[PDB]
């Protein structure tokens, strides 16, 4: 599931809390934000992004 403390957004397994920074690789794309009731704005991390500067 997704969760936040109130300042940092995270994803965690559903039966023992362990916050992961929300990377692409924790997640999958669908559609657009018009249809999902209660969706939230954020940034999602791309692990390749710094490697493009390297």
């Amino acid at each position: 599931v997704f969760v936040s403390n109130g300042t940092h957004w995270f994803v965690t397994q559903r039966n023992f809390y362990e916050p992961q920074i929300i990377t692409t690789d924790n997640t999958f794309v669908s559609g657009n934000c018009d249809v999902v009731i209660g969706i939230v704005n954020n940034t999602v991390y791309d692990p390749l992004q710094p490697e493009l500067d390297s």
Binding site: V1, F28, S30, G31, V35, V36, I37, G38, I39
Partner: protein, 49 residues
């Protein structure tokens, strides 16, 4: 509750994007289906055999 149904779908091998992309329809489907339970139990005499 929608976040629960997104697990219920994930448990039958349906990826949960198919839930939220349909939530208002799935609500209407289930509300209507509960509606038929009144009629099924109320109108039929043999229903509790």
């Amino acid at each position: 509750f929608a976040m629960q149904m997104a697990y219920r779908f994930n448990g039958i091998g349906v990826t949960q994007n198919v839930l939220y992309e349909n939530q208002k329809l799935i609500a209407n489907q289930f509300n209507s289906a509960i509606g038929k339970i009144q009629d099924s139990l109320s109108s039929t005499a043999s229903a509790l055999g």
